[PDB]
Amino acid sequence: SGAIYVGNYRVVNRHLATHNDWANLVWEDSSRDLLVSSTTAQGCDTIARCDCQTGVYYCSSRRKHYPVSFSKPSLIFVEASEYYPARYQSHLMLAVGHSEPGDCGGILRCQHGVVGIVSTGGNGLVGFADVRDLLWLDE
């Protein structure tokens, strides 16, 4: 679990969105596993606007942060789950690191701010849904 709170927006994994997220929907994209909902309170986070390929992510299944080298956002095949059929997930970044299903929502940050959230993993890999291209989050 986990979310990004920036301005009057809450960014979560689309497959973990609540009834309240859907009732306050701003934008969602099944191909990216992302959903953004509106909030009444002002958020705590800053979004990175950069091309960093190194950062640190929070891994809830270890209660620890780990440093990672990650690939540029791209289209990657993701096997069928209870949430989605087998498909290509877009804007996805891979890195070597521990992750388990319940780790989705953990934040990946670089020195410039929030880069994205854990969305996939397995076999010593961790995949992150990028948010740096969503310029409208800052207005």
Is 78 a binding residue for Zn ion by CB under 5 A? The answer is: no
Residue with smaller CB distance to Zn ion, 46 or 61: 46
Q: Is 110 annotated as a binding residue?
A: yes
Give the single-character DSSP code of 82.
S
Residue 104 among the catalytic residues: yes
Which of 11, 68, 16 lies closest to 45, judged by CA?
A: 11
Catalytic residue among 91, 103, 104, 130: 104
3-state secondary structure of 24: coil
- Helix H or strand E segment including 21: helix 19-23
Residue 15 among the catalytic residues: yes
CA atoms within 13 A on the CB side of 104: 17
Is 37 a binding residue for ligand A1BQI by CB under 6 A? The answer is: no
Q: Which of 26, 39, 60, 84 binds ligand A1BQI (CB under 6 A)?
A: 84
Q: How far is CA 108 from CA 80, 81, 103, in A?
A: 24, 23, 12
Partner interacting with residue 65 (select from ligand A1BQI, Zn ion, none; CB below 5-8 Å by kind): none
Q: Which of 25, 50, 96, 125 binds Zn ion (CB under 5 A)?
A: 50
The least distance separating ligand A1BQI from the CB of residue 56, rounded to whole angstroms, comes to: 17
